[PDB]
Design a protein around this ligand. Structure first.
Ligand SMILES: CC(=O)N[C@@H]1[C@@H](O)[C@H](O[C@@H]2O[C@H](CO)[C@H](O)[C@H](O[C@]3(C(=O)O)C[C@H](O)[C@@H](NC(C)=O)[C@H]([C@H](O)[C@H](O)CO)O3)[C@H]2O)[C@@H](CO)O[C@H]1O
Ligand SMILES: *[C@@H]1O[C@H](CO)[C@@H](O)[C@H](O)[C@H]1NC(C)=O
Ligand SMILES: *[C@@H]1O[C@H](CO)[C@@H](O)[C@H](O)[C@H]1NC(C)=O
Ligand SMILES: *[C@@H]1O[C@H](CO)[C@@H](O)[C@H](O)[C@H]1NC(C)=O
Ligand SMILES: *[C@@H]1O[C@H](CO)[C@@H](O)[C@H](O)[C@H]1NC(C)=O
Ligand SMILES: *[C@@H]1O[C@H](CO)[C@@H](O)[C@H](O)[C@H]1NC(C)=O
Ligand SMILES: *[C@@H]1O[C@H](CO)[C@@H](O)[C@H](O)[C@H]1NC(C)=O
Lengths: 326, 173, 172, 325, 173, 330
């Protein structure tokens, strides 16, 4: 007799999804939601190239290690790439205080303009030009200093007078600046470099106070130095004013940065190439429409959510039961 | 399968039905074939797509981990930062994975029920004007027109018109 | 619908049935009307009510967001607190919204199931004494009293009692 | 022709919609909104307790004893604090309040403070305690004044400034919040003028705390006409602990201190009014008076509040899908 | 119950059927007894077991809480730690609790589905050769020895074989 | 009268219930409890390694060498640390151990320590090393004594305290945890008597570290009979690094120090007074041992080892069987 039958669709599909009840279930149609593939290079985000610090670390860049001259001047970046083996950082031994906070503040930027904050003529009656060290060679000069700092020394005949400077911010933009305090290894060096007697370095603004004096002692040799320098940084707010006062041991601000304010700082090896991305992770570019990724949780731009799954496949079709043919 | 139709009392799918998920196979003196039921296939398609879209939209935020460094005096906050980031990572992987397993269980159920319901729609129309073979098939006790096949499909089967031809045959046997 | 009764083989609902979710409509020489099945309606009400309070009770904990101040050497812990509070915000927003979408889907099917099982229950009582139309309506092969209609809803329907009378007109 | 019995389902005039995973904009016969999106824009009493309105004073201004903040001067009890955003009376003599954020956190964890004289002016011998005023700290009545909780100690007209000493032994059961300072003159001339010559120190110790500081003379930019600075400090004397204070100059002595009493604390920076209404749920943007489980109003609140979430709507279908004729 | 079989149209359960979840009770001249349907209880056991395993797997990370000390200039980060840990504990309690409420509801549905399907299977075989009493029980309109009972249970019942007997018995009553 | 076949389901004597979204207290035939509430109120060896029981000593009292902590004095290997709530022997000469919370964190992570003489007394020239004792720090056997890992250095009878210098070069593969301090006299009187007159300092440096302190003279509340304070300090001398010590006075010198081995564990310090026994455990919480297959745990958030996820819940029973409707007998 005449037949009518109810039934369902089947196909040559071999893709399986999992289920709470059943593990390896073949279905007619399905959508993978997770991206596991990455491009492996650094690219442009929003058509804004990153900054490659190359052979320099964040410290070497921003203090102006003489060997870091390649990066000197204005910079605009979408993200920063620090290479993990970079050897050009703090050349004259010492601590850069609140370093992590500074690495975080620069990470929060997209642009800096370099400008002379304190001309060397600011400090009267002292030798501004005599003060380089063999710990800070440039590539051409065996004895140099950071391009953003002035190691100030007393004039050919003593003594080191009190020296004073002020800078008024005036502008729209915050200013990032730096200074240091020298700590000779000996009374003898302290006497030679600076006048005899108690020395001080003092700085202040409407909202901030600094005061330090030399801690004289011989520390273990590091790049030929048993002396040390304490480095410091701060941010002059727009409309704020800085006062500087010292009678010795000041490593003075010279040049500073106007700073413009999510950003990232990638420590990585990957090459930076001529391309665009809308999504950049620390281990590669994502070029996907997928919802989840297993490449990395560290990224910038618009990226799919990061999960530790191998696959997230999601069945749209029905259970596939094609009729067998031999 | 939970409503029992798919891979159930209907043991297999039709590789020959390519225009829909759910369907009719007819055989009649004028020919035979496989024909998808459009309305129920389309509704299943709207539903399933909405579900995929909804999941996509609900998953459309990201938790961002960070590059921050920590000194050898900042071990406790460094560790706080890691436990936090790994904690949200575990929560979201759980959610993703659990969601998929649960929504796959229920999408297959949904298909099963649409088939079962198509089967009931026809069995209630035909009554004893046809005989239940197994596997979701019905054999008519009466000659069935192409037009008759269409009436059974679109929902307007005329039972009284055939009841006597059917009964004469049913137990003329 | 998914059990197929609601917006399905019973094409529409009844503006007329005011006292229940699921119900019976009858027609006979004496009149026509609507009547709710008290048992299954109440069964569903208790169900849904339980579900709603289960969900409310489980959503009872709140996350404390604090708004402590941070200094300008505290950008890292300030940022950490912000990402932390916004992470928990995102998770609870996802939980709540997803729970509502899934729960709405399941509550709709519950209603569909209960209606389907009501239809089967009557169908099961009447057997061949009535003709089952496509739309969830039965045409009696005999004269049905208000007592007889009420015995169907009660589940006390006497099938043999009408079997002969039904056999006849079924033959006419 | 035959009698008929039909199975079917309720319909109604509803146009309220819900969303399910499978479909959007589904009219349902009965639903419940779980999320509250409305508020009274004001601050109200919580546990039948009024909040502290700082008014024109910042928390700094209030607890130091800023002369323009005399209204807040006595004992205080609160259910939360309202700091207004553009409040102008804070630190009057320019300087830094050390561990400010942390101080702000400690204050809010409290519910009450009692003010009392911890160190009577007579504590310090051979030194003037009546000349410590500045034209930077003026009360409404007078041009030159000082924080009410500190004493600016200064050299007697006869030189010089000698070692001065004080101790307090906390015998009560409540912690004590107190303050002090160290003056930082612009010049050695101001130094000499007000204190002696020689190396000056301010040293403080309890059983768990050590403090030592010396003057740092230099000229900072002018703030409120002042190129000098004061470093302010705060600490907490525990029940059972003794405070020793010693200095030969540059010390702003603590004059008054607070017994401190410590639930969920709130400091709300806002400009909303404080009205005589009562409430159970207060957010920084207003009051919630509601039975609903979820709110979209603010993450910041005190009292029993619904959970905050970013959704605009969380409606659960209770009724079946509504299809009428 | 949701499929309406369990504590539904099948009112109670059998303490006597001890070798499975879903089963047949039979009565005949040869005797009476209980026999669990083995294929469907087996599938049920596989599925429930996988469900239990899936949940145990997806729940197999642990958030780390730490024992670190905080000084009293560290009120803010210590509170930050406390809220961070409480925050995840609240999230996981919620996930575990809701999951069990939901799966518990669905697992009871599954069982209801298999009972109902088992009954639907038998009913479609017997057709009018048997009489439906309530409570999931069928009375045969013919003799049904053990061979016949197994055949119903096996899915191979021979309706044509016993149709004439059943039809004559019916008329007689 | 006729032949019956019926379809039904299993039932049993089960009185175990579960909740579901729609209904509470449902009795089911089969179920599984996923949460563990049972524990042993004791501390057990983790990865077959015994924890450190500080007994009547605090963590500070232990690594400074409080003279009464001599049962602990030496090398120790541990899988974690237990500090008794009411330990008496901590810091016995009053003062702050700076960055203490960060020291406790570091110690926890935290596997083993080998004690050794880092600076022998001869290191310090022209000063007296035999007088650095107080009645604050008795041993069980002497009224007056001093920490075992420190030297309190005082001026020789000639009333000049010379500048003294010390060097230590870490020529090894492990970090060295070490301690020192700065004495703060209640007096100039005491100051002059103990140390040479005139401005005093303690400076210390390594390749990456600098430190400079001078005494802060002041009369402070009596603690252990002392109005003077000592400021204690701690550092870690990395492999290949050199420490330079220089004082003109008020130095409490490093004497003994620790080769420190860092762990692959996670590390834990437990404040608790539960007993410690010769038993092995896979999971150790702060309130007890767990010995379970369950997925979730009632007992604690704080543990070392492999533990179920912590949760608030009273119970997480999962239905596996069906609704249990046994027939009624009477
Ligand atoms: C106001 C008041 O009563 N307090 C002090 C009082 O504390 C102080 O006496 C000190 O008393 C303690 C016990 O309370 C000891 O007896 C001190 O003697 C020793 C000690 O601590 O054992 C002797 C020891 O040989 C000294 N150690 C060395 C190496 O010098 C130490 C050490 O000098 C002191 O700790 C330095 O502060 O002291 C005893 O000095 C007296 C003393 O001036 O003053 C009262 O006012
Ligand atoms: C420490 O020892 C190493 C290895 O012998 C040596 O290279 C280094 O110069 C020494 N440092 C000092 C400060 O003596
Ligand atoms: C549906 O069936 C009726 C009878 O077969 C037929 O006339 C009609 O054309 C079919 N449906 C339509 C109009 O699409
Ligand atoms: C049930 O039906 C009977 C008729 O069979 C009727 O007399 C009786 O009142 C009904 N019971 C209820 C509760 O309506
Ligand atoms: C709908 O019903 C409610 C109560 O029946 C009634 O108040 C309202 O007026 C109705 N809606 C319309 C159509 O106005
Ligand atoms: C402080 O007062 C308490 C009073 O109970 C007394 O026991 C203690 O010795 C006094 N302490 C000091 C250091 O004055
Ligand atoms: C469960 O039921 C018992 C009584 O059956 C009751 O005591 C308890 O409150 C109910 N709730 C729980 C604990 O699940």
């Amino acid at each position: 007799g005449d037949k009518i039958c109810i039934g369902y669709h089947a196909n040559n599909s071999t893709t399986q999804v999992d289920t709470l009840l059943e593990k390896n279930v073949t279905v007619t149609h399905s959508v993978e939601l997770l991206e596991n593939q990455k491009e492996k290079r650094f690219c442009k985000i929003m058509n804004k190239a990153p900054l490659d610090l190359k052979d320099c670390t964040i410290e070497g860049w921003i203090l102006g290690n003489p060997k870091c001259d390649l990066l000197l001047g204005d910079q605009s970046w979408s993200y920063i790439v620090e290479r993990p083996n970079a050897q050009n950082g703090i050349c004259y031994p010492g601590v850069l205080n609140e370093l992590e906070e500074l690495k975080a503040f620069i990470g929060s930027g997209e642009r800096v303009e370099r400008f002379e904050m304190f001309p060397k003529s600011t400090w009267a009656g002292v030798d501004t030009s005599r003060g380089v060290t063999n710990a800070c060679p440039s590539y051409t000069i065996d004895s140099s200093f950071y391009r953003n700092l002035v190691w100030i020394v007393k004039t050919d005949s003593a003594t080191y007078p009190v020296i004073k400077g002020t800078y008024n911010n005036t502008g729209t933009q915050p200013i990032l600046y730096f200074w240091g305090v020298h700590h000779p290894l000996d009374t003898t060096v302290q006497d030679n470099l600076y006048g005899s007697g108690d020395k001080y370095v003092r700085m202040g603004t409407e909202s901030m106070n600094f005061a330090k004096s030399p801690e004289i002692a011989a520390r273990p040799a590091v790049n030929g130095q048993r002396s040390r320098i304490d480095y410091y940084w701060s941010v002059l707010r727009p409309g704020e004013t800085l006062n500087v006062e010292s009678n010795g041991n000041l490593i003075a601000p010279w040049y500073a940065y106007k700073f413009v304010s999510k950003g990232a700082v990638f420590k990585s090896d990957l090459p930076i190439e001529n391309c665009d991305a809308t999504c950049q992770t620390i281990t590669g570019v994502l070029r996907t429409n997928k919802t989840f990724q297993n490449v990395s949780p560290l990224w910038i731009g618009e990226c799919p959510k990061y999960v530790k799954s191998e696959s997230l496949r999601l069945a749209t079709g029905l259970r596939n039961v094609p009729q067998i043919a031999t | 399968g939970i409503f029992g139709a798919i891979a159930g009392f209907i043991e297999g799918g039709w590789t020959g039905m390519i225009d829909g998920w759910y369907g009719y196979h007819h055989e009649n003196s004028q020919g035979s074939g496989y024909a998808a039921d459009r309305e129920s296939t389309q509704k299943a398609i709207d539903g399933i797509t909405n579900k995929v879209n909804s999941i996509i939209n609900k998953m459309n935020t990201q938790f961002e981990a960070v590059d921050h460094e920590f000194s050898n005096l900042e071990r406790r906050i460094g560790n706080l930062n890691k436990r936090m980031e790994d904690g949200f990572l575990d929560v979201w992987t759980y959610n993703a994975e659990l969601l998929v397993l649960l929504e796959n269980e229920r999408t297959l159920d949904l298909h099963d029920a649409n088939v079962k319901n198509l089967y009931e729609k026809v069995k209630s129309q035909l009554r004893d004007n046809a005989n239940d073979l197994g596997n979701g098939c019905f054999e008519f006790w009466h000659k069935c027109d192409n037009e008759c096949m269409e009436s059974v499909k679109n929902g307007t089967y005329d039972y009284p018109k055939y009841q006597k031809e059917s009964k004469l045959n049913r137990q003329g046997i």
